[PDB]
Amino acid sequence: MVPISPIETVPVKLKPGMDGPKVKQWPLTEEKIKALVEICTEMEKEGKISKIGPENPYNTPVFAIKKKDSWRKLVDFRELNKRTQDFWEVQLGIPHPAGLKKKKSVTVLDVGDAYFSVPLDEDFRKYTAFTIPSINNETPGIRYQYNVLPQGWKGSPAIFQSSMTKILEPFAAQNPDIVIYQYMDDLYVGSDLEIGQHRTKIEELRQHLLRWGLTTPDKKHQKEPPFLWMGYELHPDKWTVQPIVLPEKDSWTVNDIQKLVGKLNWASQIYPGIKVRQLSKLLRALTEVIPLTEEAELELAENREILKEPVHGVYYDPSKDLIAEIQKQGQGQWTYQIYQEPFKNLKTGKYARMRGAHTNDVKQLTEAVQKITTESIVIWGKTPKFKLPIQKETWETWWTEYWQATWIPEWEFVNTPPLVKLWYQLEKEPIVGAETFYVDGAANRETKLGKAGYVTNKGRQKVVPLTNTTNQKTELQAIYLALQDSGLEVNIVTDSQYALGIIQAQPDKSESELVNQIIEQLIKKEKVYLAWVPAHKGIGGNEQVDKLV
Amino acid sequence: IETVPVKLKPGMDGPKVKQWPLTEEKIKALVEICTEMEKEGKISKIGPENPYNTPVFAIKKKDSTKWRKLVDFRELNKRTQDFWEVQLGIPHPAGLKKKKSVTVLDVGDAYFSVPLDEDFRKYTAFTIPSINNETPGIRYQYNVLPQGWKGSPAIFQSSMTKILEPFKKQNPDIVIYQYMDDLYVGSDLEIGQHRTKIEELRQHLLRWGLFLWMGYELHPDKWTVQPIVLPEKDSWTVNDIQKLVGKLNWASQIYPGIKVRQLSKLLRGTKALTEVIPLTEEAELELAENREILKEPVHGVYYDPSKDLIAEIQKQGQGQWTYQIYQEPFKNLKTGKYARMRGAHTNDVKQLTEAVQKITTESIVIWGKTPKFKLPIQKETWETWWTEYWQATWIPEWEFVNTPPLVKLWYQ
Ligand SMILES: Cc1cc(/C=C/C#N)cc(C)c1Nc1nc(Nc2ccc(C#N)cc2)nc(OCCCN2CCOCC2)n1
């Protein structure tokens, strides 16, 4: 007998104040009971379980399920899981193919044997107790408890991975010419070694695993490239998403679009130029059929054009530079590609604007850059160089005059329309020679009736009456009137902190049709100076009296 | 050699804070650092039975080429029991902010000599993440007092007190203050003899049994303060007078008898913004009386240790920043202005980050705790970049203002 090393057990406890499961064992057919007894007899013979006396008060329901009409044992650990402590789950966040490195050889080994070589904490085994009902309920049912990590239990996947990692750790550290990764019951080893050396390293690994009594099926594993893994397709020199098929339908329900958006969202990480807004603006009742707008139908038609052919992403090469390029798609949609060599994307992606009342392209661009930056640190551990559709001069003007602090990491201008620009720019000082418009708005809170208008230094005046409106709309309306009736240069004086707060935010697009009209007016102007004064302070010009009525 | 019992607040479990993405350079540093701390018994690997986690990253202190490990114990700190010591609460040295020169020392390594309570160690767990989640993260927990934790100065306070006794009896004029991992030493001595007394102190610390070589010299007696000032012009345009009235109307929220009537009387009629307006006698008098009022202090402005300090920061452009510390609106305990050029000429975020640090440092000296910041920046921009420029061993709290405040130019 060759001495094998024990595997360190992990101290498991129940949540504070709680106790183990006490669930009644369900009555089983004589057919199923016979099946379970045989199974648990050899499991005991393998050391996976053990018979326990009447002392144990804990119980967990065990079922028997016909393995596709051929018996399988199924212990329902749902009650124990709710009462088991929280673990440090390590799978949280799967690797992304774009961050991996190409391998000449990637071998797979089965780790179904090593699972039952991981023992459970001695003081916790009692909580895993279950009963095999007796035939006709005429004897005390057979009581068992687990000795190894039970299938289905809360702590099993975490303890298994941490135990496997701890074993593979010296092998990985001493063999830096290979890479090892674990995916549920299977081990994946990759290397760029000469194939001869590669087969040996696998055997060394198998020999290393033997120290803990872990045997691989000593055979050439059927699994070979390409690998189907977490929705991806892994090839030795490239990667892609598992085939995206857009279904042909005359009737789309709420659920169908969710299936459509989800696939489009998933495919957007390698298929460039994927749009989803006009299909996401329909899900604003999964069986309810929703009519697809003409604007959305044209988007789906463009989607099928992009999903026409398979596209592949390359792997990461640490010796080269990392580049991210962004393009504006319109309607608050942005798309990007990340590459090292031209026309060879590591991955792609998209960004959608946040739900707000007002917004501009420069802000969205910044948000996209930050998202990509955060994603790129996760995947590659560094920040890509950016190629942006915005002039250097435009960015400088923006951030040196913006009230908030803002920053874009190292980037260059790429001239691929539609370019991002500033549409209007307010003056810092009053304009000499320009007509001065004192504007004001007011509305009766009850009748919803209100007035808006202005007075000027040249004697120009206007007051318009308005129905179905608020104080905030009439304040905005007043500014719009001044813009309409003024020349290319104009000074506007308002007491509305609300209006100022909006225009100081500098939107180029908005939900409110009122604000949009103002923006279209600002754009047409050569110079606009906005000035604020407090209300009701008897500041002449500020003519509340024309709107108070 | 013996540990002091530590627990959490009743009804609160340990911190379960996600580790945020780290760059390759910071991961390598943290690995290299944690390798050695494990060999020194400072930290120990842990298993999956430990669900608790606290973020970690890496910085470079003021003018240094050596990485420092920084743990974000902000969650653990607000969950660990209000650690009152045998001190019954140290009264914050109100003479510290009056000293001519204050140097700040890093006595963090001193904490590594005192062991941590075994039952509490599980709460200090942290993860060194891997790029792209390829390998599992390396999990450690502390075995000694961790830098950054609230209980570290409190526990070590019993030790630190009798370490500095030979220095405090010899120099009864020097004021010494300890916040977190930083030791604040202020004196009225000349900077030359100041640096010697500091060097004497760190050699007095190294001898006692404990990078304590870097110094951070402040000057509280030369610190910036801001009264409210109004313009002095020979010719006022309508726009000038309109901004003045706006500023006075705002200041009236702070000061009692502010009047704008006579000044507004000049604005009566609809004139051009750039038109010069001669001041009347009643207007000049009103403006004169208003200057007088603004020179006096604000009425009823006190500090309450049981309340939060709040800091507001405005970007003024051209590298300048203004800020106000208060607990009650219009009740400023401190105001200030910056214009620093520490390699941030083309970076708003680095400036803001240095501003937040400078304001926090000031706040520790004056009141002995950190303010809750309100930053003129989107959450997503700040969260992506502030760690790249952070050089302080502590970390304040902050929220984000998204609407442009009108009161920006009234502080410039
Ligand atoms: C996540 C992952 C999934 C699977 C399979 C799942 C299924 N089913 C398999 C592995 C092995 C990994 N882990 C991993 N994989 C790669 N690449 C890679 C390329 C192609 C294929 C295919 N086909 C598979 C993998 N690279 C790294 O790290 C980069 C180290 C850079 N080296 C270090 C040595 O000196 C040289 C530089 N880790």
mmCIF file of all heavy atoms in Angstrom, chain A residues 284-322:
data_model
loop_
_atom_site.group_PDB
_atom_site.id
_atom_site.type_symbol
_atom_site.label_atom_id
_atom_site.label_comp_id
_atom_site.label_asym_id
_atom_site.label_seq_id
_atom_site.Cartn_x
_atom_site.Cartn_y
_atom_site.Cartn_z
ATOM 1 N N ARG A 284 -40.670 48.385 -22.389
ATOM 2 C CA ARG A 284 -40.728 49.430 -21.372
ATOM 3 C C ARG A 284 -41.742 49.105 -20.278
ATOM 4 O O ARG A 284 -42.784 48.503 -20.543
ATOM 5 C CB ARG A 284 -41.071 50.775 -22.017
ATOM 6 C CG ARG A 284 -40.383 51.015 -23.352
ATOM 7 C CD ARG A 284 -39.351 52.129 -23.271
ATOM 8 N NE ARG A 284 -39.660 53.220 -24.190
ATOM 9 C CZ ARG A 284 -38.864 54.263 -24.411
ATOM 10 N NH1 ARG A 284 -37.701 54.358 -23.782
ATOM 11 N NH2 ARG A 284 -39.232 55.210 -25.264
ATOM 12 N N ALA A 285 -46.316 39.933 -18.170
ATOM 13 C CA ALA A 285 -47.115 39.633 -19.352
ATOM 14 C C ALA A 285 -46.236 39.155 -20.502
ATOM 15 O O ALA A 285 -46.246 39.744 -21.582
ATOM 16 C CB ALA A 285 -47.920 40.853 -19.773
ATOM 17 N N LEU A 286 -45.486 38.082 -20.268
ATOM 18 C CA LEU A 286 -44.551 37.555 -21.260
ATOM 19 C C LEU A 286 -45.261 36.956 -22.474
ATOM 20 O O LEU A 286 -44.641 36.719 -23.511
ATOM 21 C CB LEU A 286 -43.635 36.501 -20.627
ATOM 22 C CG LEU A 286 -42.693 36.931 -19.500
ATOM 23 C CD1 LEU A 286 -43.370 36.843 -18.135
ATOM 24 C CD2 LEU A 286 -41.415 36.103 -19.525
ATOM 25 N N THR A 287 -46.563 36.713 -22.341
ATOM 26 C CA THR A 287 -47.351 36.123 -23.419
ATOM 27 C C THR A 287 -47.984 37.181 -24.325
ATOM 28 O O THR A 287 -48.488 36.865 -25.403
ATOM 29 C CB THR A 287 -48.465 35.213 -22.862
ATOM 30 O OG1 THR A 287 -49.104 35.861 -21.754
ATOM 31 C CG2 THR A 287 -47.885 33.887 -22.392
ATOM 32 N N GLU A 288 -47.952 38.435 -23.884
ATOM 33 C CA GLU A 288 -48.558 39.528 -24.636
ATOM 34 C C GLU A 288 -47.792 39.840 -25.918
ATOM 35 O O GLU A 288 -46.592 40.112 -25.886
ATOM 36 C CB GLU A 288 -48.651 40.786 -23.767
ATOM 37 C CG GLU A 288 -49.158 42.015 -24.505
ATOM 38 C CD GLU A 288 -49.381 43.196 -23.583
ATOM 39 O OE1 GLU A 288 -49.431 42.988 -22.352
ATOM 40 O OE2 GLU A 288 -49.506 44.332 -24.086
ATOM 41 N N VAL A 289 -48.494 39.800 -27.044
ATOM 42 C CA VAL A 289 -47.896 40.121 -28.333
ATOM 43 C C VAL A 289 -47.782 41.632 -28.511
ATOM 44 O O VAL A 289 -48.779 42.350 -28.450
ATOM 45 C CB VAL A 289 -48.711 39.530 -29.500
ATOM 46 C CG1 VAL A 289 -48.106 39.937 -30.834
ATOM 47 C CG2 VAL A 289 -48.786 38.015 -29.384
ATOM 48 N N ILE A 290 -46.560 42.108 -28.728
ATOM 49 C CA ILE A 290 -46.316 43.532 -28.929
ATOM 50 C C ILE A 290 -45.970 43.830 -30.384
ATOM 51 O O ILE A 290 -45.085 43.193 -30.955
ATOM 52 C CB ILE A 290 -45.179 44.042 -28.022
ATOM 53 C CG1 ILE A 290 -45.571 43.903 -26.551
ATOM 54 C CG2 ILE A 290 -44.834 45.488 -28.349
ATOM 55 C CD1 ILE A 290 -44.584 44.535 -25.599
ATOM 56 N N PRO A 291 -46.675 44.798 -30.991
ATOM 57 C CA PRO A 291 -46.403 45.204 -32.374
ATOM 58 C C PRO A 291 -45.022 45.835 -32.525
ATOM 59 O O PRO A 291 -44.679 46.760 -31.788
ATOM 60 C CB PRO A 291 -47.507 46.227 -32.665
ATOM 61 C CG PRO A 291 -47.914 46.738 -31.327
ATOM 62 C CD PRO A 291 -47.784 45.567 -30.399
ATOM 63 N N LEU A 292 -44.239 45.329 -33.472
ATOM 64 C CA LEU A 292 -42.895 45.842 -33.704
ATOM 65 C C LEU A 292 -42.926 47.052 -34.627
ATOM 66 O O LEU A 292 -43.418 46.975 -35.754
ATOM 67 C CB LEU A 292 -41.991 44.754 -34.290
ATOM 68 C CG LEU A 292 -41.232 43.869 -33.298
ATOM 69 C CD1 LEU A 292 -42.186 43.101 -32.397
ATOM 70 C CD2 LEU A 292 -40.299 42.913 -34.025
ATOM 71 N N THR A 293 -42.398 48.169 -34.139
ATOM 72 C CA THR A 293 -42.356 49.404 -34.912
ATOM 73 C C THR A 293 -41.508 49.235 -36.171
ATOM 74 O O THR A 293 -40.670 48.338 -36.249
ATOM 75 C CB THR A 293 -41.802 50.575 -34.072
ATOM 76 O OG1 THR A 293 -40.508 50.231 -33.562
ATOM 77 C CG2 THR A 293 -42.731 50.885 -32.905
ATOM 78 N N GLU A 294 -41.742 50.095 -37.157
ATOM 79 C CA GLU A 294 -40.976 50.072 -38.397
ATOM 80 C C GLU A 294 -39.508 50.393 -38.127
ATOM 81 O O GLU A 294 -38.612 49.885 -38.803
ATOM 82 C CB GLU A 294 -41.559 51.064 -39.409
ATOM 83 C CG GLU A 294 -40.782 51.159 -40.714
ATOM 84 C CD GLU A 294 -41.272 52.284 -41.604
ATOM 85 O OE1 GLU A 294 -42.418 52.744 -41.411
ATOM 86 O OE2 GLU A 294 -40.508 52.711 -42.495
ATOM 87 N N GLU A 295 -39.276 51.236 -37.126
ATOM 88 C CA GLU A 295 -37.926 51.643 -36.754
ATOM 89 C C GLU A 295 -37.160 50.495 -36.091
ATOM 90 O O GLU A 295 -35.932 50.434 -36.163
ATOM 91 C CB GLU A 295 -37.978 52.854 -35.819
ATOM 92 C CG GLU A 295 -38.967 53.933 -36.244
ATOM 93 C CD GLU A 295 -38.552 54.656 -37.512
ATOM 94 O OE1 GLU A 295 -37.351 54.619 -37.856
ATOM 95 O OE2 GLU A 295 -39.427 55.270 -38.161
ATOM 96 N N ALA A 296 -37.892 49.591 -35.446
ATOM 97 C CA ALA A 296 -37.289 48.433 -34.793
ATOM 98 C C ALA A 296 -37.076 47.293 -35.782
ATOM 99 O O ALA A 296 -36.126 46.520 -35.659
ATOM 100 C CB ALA A 296 -38.153 47.968 -33.632
ATOM 101 N N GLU A 297 -37.970 47.196 -36.760
ATOM 102 C CA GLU A 297 -37.889 46.156 -37.778
ATOM 103 C C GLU A 297 -36.668 46.369 -38.665
ATOM 104 O O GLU A 297 -36.060 45.412 -39.144
ATOM 105 C CB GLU A 297 -39.164 46.136 -38.625
ATOM 106 C CG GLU A 297 -39.539 44.766 -39.175
ATOM 107 C CD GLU A 297 -40.283 43.909 -38.164
ATOM 108 O OE1 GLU A 297 -40.117 44.131 -36.947
ATOM 109 O OE2 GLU A 297 -41.044 43.014 -38.590
ATOM 110 N N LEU A 298 -36.315 47.633 -38.874
ATOM 111 C CA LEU A 298 -35.143 47.986 -39.664
ATOM 112 C C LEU A 298 -33.865 47.660 -38.895
ATOM 113 O O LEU A 298 -32.813 47.428 -39.488
ATOM 114 C CB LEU A 298 -35.176 49.469 -40.041
ATOM 115 C CG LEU A 298 -34.150 49.947 -41.071
ATOM 116 C CD1 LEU A 298 -34.390 49.282 -42.419
ATOM 117 C CD2 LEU A 298 -34.186 51.462 -41.199
ATOM 118 N N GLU A 299 -33.968 47.640 -37.570
ATOM 119 C CA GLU A 299 -32.833 47.313 -36.716
ATOM 120 C C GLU A 299 -32.572 45.811 -36.710
ATOM 121 O O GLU A 299 -31.424 45.371 -36.773
ATOM 122 C CB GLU A 299 -33.077 47.814 -35.292
ATOM 123 C CG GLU A 299 -31.873 47.700 -34.375
ATOM 124 C CD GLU A 299 -32.193 48.106 -32.950
ATOM 125 O OE1 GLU A 299 -32.950 47.371 -32.281
ATOM 126 O OE2 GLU A 299 -31.698 49.164 -32.500
ATOM 127 N N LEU A 300 -33.645 45.030 -36.633
ATOM 128 C CA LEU A 300 -33.543 43.578 -36.673
ATOM 129 C C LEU A 300 -32.994 43.108 -38.018
ATOM 130 O O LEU A 300 -32.246 42.133 -38.090
ATOM 131 C CB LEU A 300 -34.907 42.939 -36.404
ATOM 132 C CG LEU A 300 -35.010 41.423 -36.574
ATOM 133 C CD1 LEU A 300 -34.037 40.707 -35.651
ATOM 134 C CD2 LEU A 300 -36.435 40.956 -36.323
ATOM 135 N N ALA A 301 -33.367 43.816 -39.081
ATOM 136 C CA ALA A 301 -32.885 43.507 -40.423
ATOM 137 C C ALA A 301 -31.386 43.761 -40.530
ATOM 138 O O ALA A 301 -30.679 43.070 -41.263
ATOM 139 C CB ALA A 301 -33.640 44.323 -41.461
ATOM 140 N N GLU A 302 -30.909 44.761 -39.796
ATOM 141 C CA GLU A 302 -29.484 45.060 -39.744
ATOM 142 C C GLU A 302 -28.753 44.052 -38.862
ATOM 143 O O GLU A 302 -27.572 43.776 -39.069
ATOM 144 C CB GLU A 302 -29.248 46.482 -39.231
ATOM 145 C CG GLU A 302 -29.731 47.572 -40.174
ATOM 146 C CD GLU A 302 -29.745 48.945 -39.525
ATOM 147 O OE1 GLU A 302 -29.220 49.081 -38.398
ATOM 148 O OE2 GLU A 302 -30.287 49.888 -40.142
ATOM 149 N N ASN A 303 -29.464 43.506 -37.878
ATOM 150 C CA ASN A 303 -28.897 42.497 -36.990
ATOM 151 C C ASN A 303 -28.601 41.193 -37.722
ATOM 152 O O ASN A 303 -27.549 40.582 -37.520
ATOM 153 C CB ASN A 303 -29.838 42.231 -35.814
ATOM 154 C CG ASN A 303 -29.744 43.297 -34.742
ATOM 155 O OD1 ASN A 303 -28.682 43.879 -34.521
ATOM 156 N ND2 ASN A 303 -30.857 43.558 -34.065
ATOM 157 N N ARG A 304 -29.531 40.776 -38.573
ATOM 158 C CA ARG A 304 -29.374 39.550 -39.343
ATOM 159 C C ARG A 304 -28.237 39.675 -40.348
ATOM 160 O O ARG A 304 -27.602 38.684 -40.708
ATOM 161 C CB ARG A 304 -30.677 39.199 -40.060
ATOM 162 C CG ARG A 304 -31.852 39.015 -39.121
ATOM 163 C CD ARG A 304 -33.117 38.631 -39.866
ATOM 164 N NE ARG A 304 -34.228 38.416 -38.945
ATOM 165 C CZ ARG A 304 -34.472 37.265 -38.328
ATOM 166 N NH1 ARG A 304 -33.682 36.220 -38.536
ATOM 167 N NH2 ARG A 304 -35.506 37.157 -37.503
ATOM 168 N N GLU A 305 -27.983 40.901 -40.796
ATOM 169 C CA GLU A 305 -26.898 41.167 -41.733
ATOM 170 C C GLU A 305 -25.541 40.972 -41.059
ATOM 171 O O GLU A 305 -24.583 40.516 -41.686
ATOM 172 C CB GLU A 305 -27.012 42.586 -42.296
ATOM 173 C CG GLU A 305 -26.043 42.889 -43.429
ATOM 174 C CD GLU A 305 -26.408 42.173 -44.717
ATOM 175 O OE1 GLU A 305 -27.616 42.099 -45.034
ATOM 176 O OE2 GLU A 305 -25.490 41.682 -45.409
ATOM 177 N N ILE A 306 -25.467 41.319 -39.778
ATOM 178 C CA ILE A 306 -24.232 41.186 -39.013
ATOM 179 C C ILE A 306 -24.040 39.749 -38.530
ATOM 180 O O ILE A 306 -22.914 39.252 -38.456
ATOM 181 C CB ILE A 306 -24.215 42.148 -37.809
ATOM 182 C CG1 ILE A 306 -24.427 43.587 -38.280
ATOM 183 C CG2 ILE A 306 -22.906 42.031 -37.039
ATOM 184 C CD1 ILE A 306 -24.352 44.612 -37.174
ATOM 185 N N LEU A 307 -25.144 39.079 -38.215
ATOM 186 C CA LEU A 307 -25.099 37.691 -37.769
ATOM 187 C C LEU A 307 -25.124 36.728 -38.952
ATOM 188 O O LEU A 307 -25.321 35.524 -38.785
ATOM 189 C CB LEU A 307 -26.263 37.402 -36.820
ATOM 190 C CG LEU A 307 -26.241 38.234 -35.538
ATOM 191 C CD1 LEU A 307 -27.403 37.872 -34.636
ATOM 192 C CD2 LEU A 307 -24.916 38.051 -34.809
ATOM 193 N N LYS A 308 -24.922 37.276 -40.145
ATOM 194 C CA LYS A 308 -24.921 36.496 -41.378
ATOM 195 C C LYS A 308 -23.792 35.470 -41.387
ATOM 196 O O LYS A 308 -23.993 34.310 -41.751
ATOM 197 C CB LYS A 308 -24.799 37.427 -42.586
ATOM 198 C CG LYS A 308 -24.782 36.723 -43.932
ATOM 199 C CD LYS A 308 -24.347 37.672 -45.037
ATOM 200 C CE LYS A 308 -22.951 38.217 -44.766
ATOM 201 N NZ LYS A 308 -22.452 39.069 -45.879
ATOM 202 N N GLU A 309 -22.604 35.906 -40.980
ATOM 203 C CA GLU A 309 -21.428 35.043 -40.968
ATOM 204 C C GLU A 309 -20.856 34.924 -39.560
ATOM 205 O O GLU A 309 -21.049 35.811 -38.729
ATOM 206 C CB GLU A 309 -20.358 35.580 -41.929
ATOM 207 C CG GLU A 309 -19.505 36.720 -41.366
ATOM 208 C CD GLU A 309 -20.299 37.991 -41.105
ATOM 209 O OE1 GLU A 309 -21.336 38.197 -41.772
ATOM 210 O OE2 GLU A 309 -19.886 38.785 -40.232
ATOM 211 N N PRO A 310 -20.161 33.812 -39.280
ATOM 212 C CA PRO A 310 -19.452 33.667 -38.005
ATOM 213 C C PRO A 310 -18.269 34.626 -37.899
ATOM 214 O O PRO A 310 -17.541 34.817 -38.874
ATOM 215 C CB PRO A 310 -18.971 32.211 -38.030
ATOM 216 C CG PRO A 310 -19.851 31.527 -39.022
ATOM 217 C CD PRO A 310 -20.150 32.563 -40.059
ATOM 218 N N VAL A 311 -18.088 35.228 -36.727
ATOM 219 C CA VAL A 311 -16.931 36.078 -36.473
ATOM 220 C C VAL A 311 -16.169 35.544 -35.261
ATOM 221 O O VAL A 311 -16.773 35.036 -34.316
ATOM 222 C CB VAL A 311 -17.342 37.548 -36.233
ATOM 223 C CG1 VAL A 311 -16.112 38.438 -36.133
ATOM 224 C CG2 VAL A 311 -18.244 38.033 -37.354
ATOM 225 N N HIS A 312 -14.843 35.647 -35.294
ATOM 226 C CA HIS A 312 -14.017 35.148 -34.201
ATOM 227 C C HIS A 312 -13.189 36.244 -33.530
ATOM 228 O O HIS A 312 -12.800 37.231 -34.160
ATOM 229 C CB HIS A 312 -13.089 34.036 -34.702
ATOM 230 C CG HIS A 312 -13.815 32.808 -35.158
ATOM 231 N ND1 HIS A 312 -14.524 32.758 -36.339
ATOM 232 C CD2 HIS A 312 -13.947 31.587 -34.588
ATOM 233 C CE1 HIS A 312 -15.058 31.558 -36.480
ATOM 234 N NE2 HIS A 312 -14.723 30.828 -35.431
ATOM 235 N N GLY A 313 -12.931 36.059 -32.240
ATOM 236 C CA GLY A 313 -12.045 36.938 -31.504
ATOM 237 C C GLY A 313 -10.706 36.263 -31.287
ATOM 238 O O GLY A 313 -10.631 35.035 -31.217
ATOM 239 N N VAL A 314 -9.650 37.062 -31.194
ATOM 240 C CA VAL A 314 -8.316 36.538 -30.931
ATOM 241 C C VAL A 314 -8.023 36.526 -29.433
ATOM 242 O O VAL A 314 -8.823 37.009 -28.631
ATOM 243 C CB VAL A 314 -7.235 37.355 -31.660
ATOM 244 C CG1 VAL A 314 -7.393 37.216 -33.172
ATOM 245 C CG2 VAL A 314 -7.306 38.812 -31.246
ATOM 246 N N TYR A 315 -6.878 35.961 -29.063
ATOM 247 C CA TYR A 315 -6.472 35.884 -27.662
ATOM 248 C C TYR A 315 -5.490 37.000 -27.340
ATOM 249 O O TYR A 315 -5.007 37.691 -28.238
ATOM 250 C CB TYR A 315 -5.853 34.518 -27.346
ATOM 251 C CG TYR A 315 -6.861 33.393 -27.239
ATOM 252 C CD1 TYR A 315 -6.646 32.176 -27.877
ATOM 253 C CD2 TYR A 315 -8.024 33.544 -26.497
ATOM 254 C CE1 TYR A 315 -7.564 31.143 -27.782
ATOM 255 C CE2 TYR A 315 -8.949 32.516 -26.395
ATOM 256 C CZ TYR A 315 -8.713 31.320 -27.041
ATOM 257 O OH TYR A 315 -9.627 30.296 -26.943
ATOM 258 N N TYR A 316 -5.191 37.168 -26.055
ATOM 259 C CA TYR A 316 -4.405 38.308 -25.606
ATOM 260 C C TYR A 316 -2.907 38.043 -25.659
ATOM 261 O O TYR A 316 -2.430 37.000 -25.216
ATOM 262 C CB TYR A 316 -4.815 38.708 -24.187
ATOM 263 C CG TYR A 316 -4.018 39.870 -23.647
ATOM 264 C CD1 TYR A 316 -4.120 41.131 -24.220
ATOM 265 C CD2 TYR A 316 -3.158 39.706 -22.574
ATOM 266 C CE1 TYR A 316 -3.387 42.198 -23.734
ATOM 267 C CE2 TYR A 316 -2.422 40.768 -22.080
ATOM 268 C CZ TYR A 316 -2.542 42.012 -22.663
ATOM 269 O OH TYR A 316 -1.809 43.069 -22.175
ATOM 270 N N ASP A 317 -2.171 39.007 -26.201
ATOM 271 C CA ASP A 317 -0.725 38.906 -26.325
ATOM 272 C C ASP A 317 -0.060 40.018 -25.527
ATOM 273 O O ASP A 317 0.004 41.160 -25.980
ATOM 274 C CB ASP A 317 -0.308 38.975 -27.795
ATOM 275 C CG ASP A 317 1.160 38.661 -28.004
ATOM 276 O OD1 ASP A 317 1.499 37.467 -28.158
ATOM 277 O OD2 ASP A 317 1.975 39.607 -28.024
ATOM 278 N N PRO A 318 0.443 39.683 -24.330
ATOM 279 C CA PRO A 318 0.974 40.656 -23.366
ATOM 280 C C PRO A 318 2.126 41.493 -23.914
ATOM 281 O O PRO A 318 2.466 42.524 -23.332
ATOM 282 C CB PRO A 318 1.456 39.774 -22.208
ATOM 283 C CG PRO A 318 0.683 38.505 -22.343
ATOM 284 C CD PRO A 318 0.513 38.304 -23.817
ATOM 285 N N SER A 319 2.714 41.055 -25.021
ATOM 286 C CA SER A 319 3.872 41.734 -25.589
ATOM 287 C C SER A 319 3.480 42.877 -26.521
ATOM 288 O O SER A 319 4.337 43.630 -26.980
ATOM 289 C CB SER A 319 4.754 40.735 -26.336
ATOM 290 O OG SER A 319 4.029 40.099 -27.373
ATOM 291 N N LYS A 320 2.185 43.001 -26.799
ATOM 292 C CA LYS A 320 1.697 44.063 -27.676
ATOM 293 C C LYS A 320 0.825 45.064 -26.926
ATOM 294 O O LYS A 320 0.475 44.856 -25.763
ATOM 295 C CB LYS A 320 0.918 43.474 -28.854
ATOM 296 C CG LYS A 320 1.759 42.619 -29.789
ATOM 297 C CD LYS A 320 1.089 42.457 -31.143
ATOM 298 C CE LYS A 320 1.933 41.607 -32.076
ATOM 299 N NZ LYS A 320 2.044 40.201 -31.595
ATOM 300 N N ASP A 321 0.476 46.154 -27.603
ATOM 301 C CA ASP A 321 -0.334 47.201 -26.996
ATOM 302 C C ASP A 321 -1.820 46.875 -27.074
ATOM 303 O O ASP A 321 -2.240 46.045 -27.877
ATOM 304 C CB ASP A 321 -0.051 48.545 -27.664
ATOM 305 C CG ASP A 321 0.476 49.576 -26.686
ATOM 306 O OD1 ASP A 321 0.773 49.205 -25.529
ATOM 307 O OD2 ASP A 321 0.585 50.759 -27.072
ATOM 308 N N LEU A 322 -2.610 47.527 -26.226
ATOM 309 C CA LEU A 322 -4.044 47.272 -26.157
ATOM 310 C C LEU A 322 -4.808 48.516 -26.578
ATOM 311 O O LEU A 322 -4.581 49.601 -26.043
ATOM 312 C CB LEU A 322 -4.442 46.849 -24.746
ATOM 313 C CG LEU A 322 -5.802 46.181 -24.560
ATOM 314 C CD1 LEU A 322 -5.836 44.849 -25.287
ATOM 315 C CD2 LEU A 322 -6.099 45.994 -23.079
#
